[PDB]
C-alpha cells in the first residue's frame, strides 16, 4: 500500500518535528493510531500510543502485516510495558516474533519470570544463569550461544524463536514460532 512520504519541517509549540504530512492523513483510512514514519525494505514500530510505520523504497508498507499490529496492538503493548520494552520493532520478516508474542501473553502466569538481561521468558522464578529445573520452559530467540554452544544448549538445532522445555540438561524445543 502507496502513502505519501514527502517530509515537511512543522514548528509546534516553539520546537521543529519533521512529520509525512499527506501519509499521517492517508494513514488513516486504516487505523485510528497509526503514524507514518521517516527514517529499504521497510518496518514498524508499536509504541506505548500508536504504531509508526517506515514504508518501503517504493513509499509502500505491507498492509496485512500492519493489520496485524493495528488488531492486536493492546497485547502488544501489554507485552512491551512487561518485558520493560520502551518500543518493539517488526519487519515482514518478524511473524515469528509477533507469534511468540501472541503465545506469550495467552500462556504467561504470574509465577512466569524474565531474564534481567533481554527478551527471555521462563516458566519458573527458580531460574539463574546456571540453574534451570526439569520441565520448565524457556521462551526465547537465542540458543547455543557461549563459546562452543555451551549456554542454553539445545537437543537439535533451534534458530529463532522458539518455546522449548528443559530435561536432562538441555533445552528440548516444544514449539517453533
Ligand atoms: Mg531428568
Redesign the pocket.
Known amino acids: 500500500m502507496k502513502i505519501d512520504t514527502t517530509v515537511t519541517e512543522v514548528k509546534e509549540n516553539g520546537k521543529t518535528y519533521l512529520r509525512l504530512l499527506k501519509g499521517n492523513e492517508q494513514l488513516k483510512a486504516v487505523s485510528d493510531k497509526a503514524v507514518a514514519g521517516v527514517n529499504k525494505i521497510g518496518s514498524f514500530l508499536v509504541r506505548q500510543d500508536n504504531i509508526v510505520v517506515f514504508p518501503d523504497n517504493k513509499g509502500e508498507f505491507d498492509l496485512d502485516f500492519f493489520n496485524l499490529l493495528n488488531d492486536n496492538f493492546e497485547t502488544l503493548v501489554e507485552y512491551a510495558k512487561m518485558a520493560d520494552c520502551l518500543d518493539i520493532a517488526f519487519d515482514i520478516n518478524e511473524k515469528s516474533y509477533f507469534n511468540m508474542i501472541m503465545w506469550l501473553m495467552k500462556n504467561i502466569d504470574e509465577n512466569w519470570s524474565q531474564s534481567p538481561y533481554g527478551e527471555s521468558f521462563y516458566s519458573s522464578k527458580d531460574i539463574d544463569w546456571g540453574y534451570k529445573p ?1 520441565g520448565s520452559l524457556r521462551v526465547s530467540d537465542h540458543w547455543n550461544f557461549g563459546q562452543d554452544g555451551e549456554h542454553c544448549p539445545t537437543a537439535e538445532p533451534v534458530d529463532g524463536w522458539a518455546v522449548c522445555k528443559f ?3 538441555k533445552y528440548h524445543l516444544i514449539k517453533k514460532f
Open positions: 526439569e530435561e536432562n540438561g
